[PDB]
From Swiss-Prot:
PANTHER family in the cross-refs: LARGE RIBOSOMAL SUBUNIT PROTEIN UL2, RIBOSOMAL PROTEIN L2
Matches recorded under PROSITE patterns: RIBOSOMAL_L2
Principal place of residence: cytoplasm
GO biological process: cytoplasmic translation; maintenance of translational fidelity; ribosomal large subunit biogenesis
Keyword terms: Cytoplasm, Isopeptide bond, Phosphoprotein, Ribonucleoprotein, Ribosomal protein, RNA-binding, rRNA-binding, Ubl conjugation
Stated family: Belongs to the universal ribosomal protein uL2 family.
UniProt keyword Phosphoprotein, yes or no: yes
Gene encoding the protein: RPL2A
Name this protein carries in UniProt: Large ribosomal subunit protein uL2A
TM annotation in the entry: none
InterPro entries given in the database record: NA-bd_OB-fold, Rib_uL2_dom2, Ribosomal_uL2, Ribosomal_uL2_C, Ribosomal_uL2_CS, Ribosomal_uL2_dom3, Ribosomal_uL2_RNA-bd_dom, Translation_prot_SH3-like_sf
GO MF: RNA binding; rRNA binding; structural constituent of ribosome
Tree of life domain: Eukaryota
Cross-link (Glycyl lysine isopeptide (Lys-Gly) (interchain with G-Cter in ubiquitin)): 45, 92, 118, 144
Organism field: Saccharomyces cerevisiae (strain ATCC 204508 / S288c)
Amino acid sequence: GRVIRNQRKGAGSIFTSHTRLRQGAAKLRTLDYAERHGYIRGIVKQIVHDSGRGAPLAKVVFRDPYKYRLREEIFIANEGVHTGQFIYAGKKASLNVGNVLPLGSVPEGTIVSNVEEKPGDRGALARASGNYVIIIGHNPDENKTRVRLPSGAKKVISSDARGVIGVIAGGGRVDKPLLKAGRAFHKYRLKRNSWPKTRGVAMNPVDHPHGGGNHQHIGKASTISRGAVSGQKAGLIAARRTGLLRGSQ
RNA sequence: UAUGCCGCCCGUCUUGAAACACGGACCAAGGAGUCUAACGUCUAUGCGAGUGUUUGGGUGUAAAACCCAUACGCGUAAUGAA
RNA sequence: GCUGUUGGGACCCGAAAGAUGGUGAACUAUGCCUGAAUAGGGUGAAGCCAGAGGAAACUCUGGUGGAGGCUCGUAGCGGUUCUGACGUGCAAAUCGAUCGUCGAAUUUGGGUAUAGGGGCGAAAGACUAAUCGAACCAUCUAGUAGCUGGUUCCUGCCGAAGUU
RNA sequence: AUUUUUGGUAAGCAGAACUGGCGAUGCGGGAUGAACCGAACGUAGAGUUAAGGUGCCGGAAUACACGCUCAUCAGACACCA
RNA sequence: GAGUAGGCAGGCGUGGAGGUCAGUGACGAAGCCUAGACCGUAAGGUCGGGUCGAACGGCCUCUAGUGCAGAUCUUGGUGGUAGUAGCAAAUAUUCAAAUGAGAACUUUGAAGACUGAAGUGGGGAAAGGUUCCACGUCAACAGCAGUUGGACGUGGGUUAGUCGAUCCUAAGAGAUGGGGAAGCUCCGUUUCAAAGGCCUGAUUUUAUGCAGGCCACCAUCGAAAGGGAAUCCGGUUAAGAUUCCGGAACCUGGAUAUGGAUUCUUCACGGUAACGUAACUGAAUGUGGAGACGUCGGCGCGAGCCCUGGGAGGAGUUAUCUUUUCUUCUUAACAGCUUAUCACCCCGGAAUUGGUUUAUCCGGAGAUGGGGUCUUAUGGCUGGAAGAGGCCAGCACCUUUGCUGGCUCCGGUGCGCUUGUGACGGCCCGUGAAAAUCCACAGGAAGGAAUAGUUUUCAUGCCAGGUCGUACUGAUAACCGCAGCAGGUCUCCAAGGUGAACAGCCUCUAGUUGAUAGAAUAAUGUAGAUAAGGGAAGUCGGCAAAAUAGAUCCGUAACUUCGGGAUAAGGA
RNA sequence: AAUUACGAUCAACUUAGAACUGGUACGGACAAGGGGAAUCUGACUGUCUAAUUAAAACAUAGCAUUGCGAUGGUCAGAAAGUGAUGUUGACGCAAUGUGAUUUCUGCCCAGUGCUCUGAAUGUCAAAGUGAAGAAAUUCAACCAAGCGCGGGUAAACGGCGGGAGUAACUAUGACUCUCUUAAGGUAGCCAAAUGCCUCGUCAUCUAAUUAGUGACGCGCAUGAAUGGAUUAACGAGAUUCCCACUGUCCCUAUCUACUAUCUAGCGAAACCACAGCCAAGGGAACGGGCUUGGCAGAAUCAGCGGGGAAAGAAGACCCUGUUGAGC
RNA sequence: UUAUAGUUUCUUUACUUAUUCAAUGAAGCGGAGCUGGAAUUCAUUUUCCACGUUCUAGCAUUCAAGGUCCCAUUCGGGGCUGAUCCGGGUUGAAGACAUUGUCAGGUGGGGAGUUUGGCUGGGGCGGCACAUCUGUUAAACGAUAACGCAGAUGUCCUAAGGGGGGCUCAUGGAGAACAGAAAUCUCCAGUAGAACAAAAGGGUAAAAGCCCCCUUGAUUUUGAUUUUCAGUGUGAAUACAAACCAUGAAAGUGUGGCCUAUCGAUCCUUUAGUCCCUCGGAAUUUGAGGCUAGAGGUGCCAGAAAAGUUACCACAGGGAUAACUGGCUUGUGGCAGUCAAGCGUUCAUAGCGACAUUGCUUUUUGAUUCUUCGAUGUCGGCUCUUCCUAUCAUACCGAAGCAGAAUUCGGUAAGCGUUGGAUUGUUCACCCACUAAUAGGGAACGUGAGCUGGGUUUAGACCGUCGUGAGACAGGUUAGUUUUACCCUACUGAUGAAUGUUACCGCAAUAGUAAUUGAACUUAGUACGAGAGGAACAGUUCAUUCGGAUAAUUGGUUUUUGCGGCUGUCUG
């Protein structure tokens, strides 16, 4: 049998990200002395689009404390952030929308975003459109704060891990229907080559573990094991359950 | 050449080919049981309880011919797993 | 020395295959980069302007505008039917009429990436240089064949088997 | 293929027994035919016959003898139509 | 005395080998040809005749790549079919002369035609590679012909500071440090690297040591369509020209001396202001701009073309008519002075809400109104530049060249066509490259005066611009398809009429008139057509064809996701 | 200074309106929709079998499910100081299914599969542990994961036909039992592209209909995202009927051009054992040749498609082969 | 008992330094000290308590201030602060876990390799005719086949083996309380009609059977022999011999079952035997290996280790073998007789016909496998010719339960014709309608270089059922390339040398041949008939189907491009 679409996506020839039209790596400015001990003021110089990503990027000009420059940094604009407004990044920075303070230096119940998994990561969590973390709990004894992720999972991050206050802008983007194929086409054309997906069942048995038959049908269980080899996984990997539930998910 | 009578197209597989079975338009040339190691039978030749010079040496008119020691193979004893 | 046996290309010619190591994206497939190309019409979306009606709630009219993976149709791109032409052709896929579509999921040049149990696939086992249910080149290789075909002078004598 | 013989409606079908043939076989005859009849074959001459025939084709009695048959679908040589 | 498969024996023939016949042979070896002969049951042998020209044989033995009709055998050659099939799509040729041995095909003239500016026009890209052009020539090729040719023979021809390449980066490809791998080499291109360059004077030790000091996540390749320093006109050759010549520019790199401008504390002044003027210091470093960008719909402007008027020339028609049919009347880069949407500035203080677009946006973060500032795209005029080019007339000139003079002017118009563009607007879960390169500012390092010095962002002046490509076709004959193949192959420019129109049909410019021809008009074909009456009865099936059709007015159903259906239908 | 709705001038083509006129002609050539009533099916535009299939197949938006919070998920690499996603972060990435909108999406974890805040020891490898021995060694308990056992799960694969009798009356909706493991096909739909019988039966369309449509349903073998029932618009899709139209036909005819034909020139190929008259006979059971008859006269031209079991290609169907390949 | 600190022995934590994951251009880490403002126990040697920037889209870069030495006080350049000291651990996670290495268990069609019996009236589905046994086939020795017939085996038995001894079995008859058809008892007959483990056959009467007594010949050693047969194996059997036993008074009999079936190689493993041999430098004991006889098994039974699928398919072959024709056959189908119980008022036969029975045909379907697998183009229709007659109509006849008309049954007879449509691809079928009638057939199931391509049967696709699945379906559905004649013959037409030349006019061998059917008027409302209905020959007039001509007329055709008209454009 052939190597499946799924299998040869990871070889990464044509399936690589379309990265010409993008502004750059959206990160928080590196964890440094000024952010540890005080905070730096930055100016939201412009708020720009980014291709394959449905959340505006806030290009915010900071200074260089050590040499005479203006180190420009590319953020993911929180909703209500505007042009020329002052962003404040550090431990001592005030609790306003746009500001970058460590989760330890923040009260409980805050709606934070662009959070770090490790301290000095420069943003990992709640980075997509209309998504945010809720800082549930705390503990200064073994300084590690409890947080609730957009997936609804509770994690425990260090107190020195930073995050930007408010929700990430561009929310409700998914609640409009994409519409007539071409909208999807154009959406995908600037992220990746993962579009118009052929159904394994509609292929020949060479091409997919679903192929063949005188009727289109999977034939055996679509719930595949976790221990299934890299090449065997087509359907639902390590499916705890299946089917449409009644009442609440 | 005429005349009387006779005479299906060869090769092939086949129980059975003139075959409505296969190859063949025609011609020239090329074109298919070989050599080798090891053996069975039968026969010729030598020597014959022996036999085999030629791996090697000596020699040479020089890949020839001629000469030759010690082994070695086989035979001269079989039967037993031993 | 004839005959015979076995291993060797083993009387000669013949597979579909398999293995090793290499060469192809000048065709077509998909993505990316950087370019280019597409008359004239129909219908008349939002936004906008002026009217009329009614106690009010609110409802009707005319114009404007110029939307649409809208629509007719040219170039273009395609290939439905004629099961037309041709079918030892113009051509190893063309010709003519008829037709699909024609501002986008469009058409396309150059550059660049993906190489064979691999690619690529809006999925037909499709396409990957007229080659694809596993490309092409060389080698292993004179592959093997209980199977087909062939197997070259004369005369003389003898003369079978299809059964255990 | 005659004879014995199983299956089968049957078969130029399938399968046996003994023998003889074709295969591997020309020749005379049954018009023609692998198998039937007669005979098996160096090259010739002469003579005589086999099976089969002797109106004409066609070598050979339109021979002899006793009967039968007249068909507007005569009949005519075994295997064999 | 038969005989397949098969066995065995006796011989026939071939290439070589040892021996022998003191073999044959240029007075003719071998080979081949022979309705001549003889021997042999046969395989075969022997002889005569011819052709030919250099070797060959009998016999006794040795040895083998040793004997052919078949293998859809191999290679090479040859046939019958057969002077047959055929050489029939791109509308089409015809008369005369010339040339020549020879003309349907060549050259010229004259007709008649076609392509019809989405072309059979004029350039190019990739590809080819001399096909370009001249002379000589026709054995081969151009499926007829050939005097012709993209053929054949010998030559000639491609001129660059400005066009490209060269440079920059794009998707990417790739050394390096390193790490993997038995190894071929694989990963990665900023990484767990000690990863060199920049300028000022110095100080004049036949020119070498300083420091003002700075600055550093770092090869290279990658576009003849992206980014990009700078060229235009006229003429010129058999064939080249944005290159040659003539005239005029411009750019970059470097040198420098005058003119200017600035300078009594020196780095200019003016305007309230937007900003202006010929200049009018400016290191490190930092900052910002340009390079730098979608697509579409209408709208304004510009250039070119199209239509069109008067006048100055020439040509065509003229039995009749026509103040008319045709045609020339053109202005490059570059330099100047000027020229505008937009934006901005001052005065002013708006509701009785005004200004205003085709499109409804704008105004107390200051409208309207009055007056100003700028971008110079774009136009105007001028210089270029009339001497050029064009259209003429008169005069000669043996050749080959001329000489002389004249006109080259003034309009108008637009939902026109192409095209550049400016300000807007619709669209997006799509918001539509980067780098080289260049500039500007912030900044204030350093330097600099008046009886002599500053400044090269301005004016003039001086010098240099290498290397490679450059001809030609770009296709119904130059590229790929075995070929001079009805196929395929990327673009640019684009006239008149009809008409909505770049549709179809006809013409102008320019280009071809090439596709074997002549005769005759049977069958059957192929591509076009028409048919009385009936009207799907044909047929698997209304396949094929017929009918309908543009525009204007009238009218428009079920159903509906309320957008449609819709050009419904049905009429005039 | 006395104070209106007005002149001069130049200039395109748009639509109205009337008259006149013709062999009722006028988008005069060119150009240029046939339309209507239904069913099946896919919502639509889009895409592919270059060279026999353009479709109802693929895609699609919508819907649903599954995995994953990075010391990760899916995937790559012989390896690695290696890589894709990822210049990414759940409104994301990855993996499936169904296929617009409307309406709904039932029941079944017994089986296969997947998963787990589930329980022991039922196994339970190597290394380790202990016993015996002179050692090699044999024997024992301890034994990780997974299996096994227990739960969860069907928009996971799938299944859901269930099957009998009694009873008003004349065909039975009340009783009764046993369930194929778990449930017994629910709402719906149909002789449907799924119905064998089948040309089902009834109606309708026709003079006549194995066709069409609408109903009926113990449905050989319909059915709920292996989606079921609708469904406007769309379709070079499959099908039926009607009107217009016609050489499709009754029934053929005629015309044009280019062929064919003849000529000059140039000039192939396929195929070919030898060849080329029949009838019967026998025969590898369908002869050009054989036997017996019929017969039979040079050279041939244009047609033709009866024959040459004509040509094209070592049947691709079927079998065999101790021959392979994709799956 | 613990009080030595002499190892992890096992489990609960901790340390950084290996290993590990990040990030920065390795800037600010850690500890302490200042200033805190303060903690109040109280101004401290006590321990809790921060360390310069926030309304605003500006700016922040070349060490300035004080202080100290040099510059002889020119020029400025330098020390420390400004900005706290010390440790040089860049920062932070993670940590002896993970990572990696090796080995081990699980999972692993993602992937690789390979397999997927045989016989066979084609394969497959069945079956076992594949190893065996009885009877029959089997043709009186033996041997003998088929998917021939009726059956059987993969076991069972310490007694159902061995010996000996007593008795007689099936069944019937007559009889004895309960007791009867059947419980037990007695006698009489009783050639086996019983019994002997099974299948069947053979065998057996003081036994081989049934009852009783004792045993283990169902033992040891190896050889020869018979059947199958190669005179191999295996199995079974026979007869002795040499040992040891059993029984019996003994003769004797006994090496498993009364006889004919009941079973299995090498290699491997395991057991029995034997003071055995070997382990090769020499000893011993384990251990292993040998020697002789068993057992664990191959049922495909002389003994591979083995699942599908292909409608995407492939190669070598095969007419040894299927799907079509043809050939023998004729069951089956179709047609036709003989006999005649009877049906038909009566009446066998006008017309039919039971029970039987003899055929003929090759338009069905089978049976077979002879031809073809280096292909004979595989259904139906369209077209077209010819033939068969088993006659639907027509011609002329005979018969009748024939009055007429109508119909039925036959004869000669294939001359003559035998249709138009709806649905279906269909052949077949079924309806409507006209006709004189709408008979049946053949000719490679006529006819594809004649067409068509609906069906069938390649590849795409959908549904149902089946399959875990790939896939399957002679189930349904839709889309799906139909090639070549120019050769010979045949056929149709067209020439033609030679009969001294040429011309005209003829004859006729042979071959062909063609006409067809209906209606209407009259006969005639006549015959016939109770009536109702209702003929026929003769005499006319027209039609259908066919054929051969012909073009006056009618219609069609138009390149007569004959005339006229009309549009677009070009020729002023």
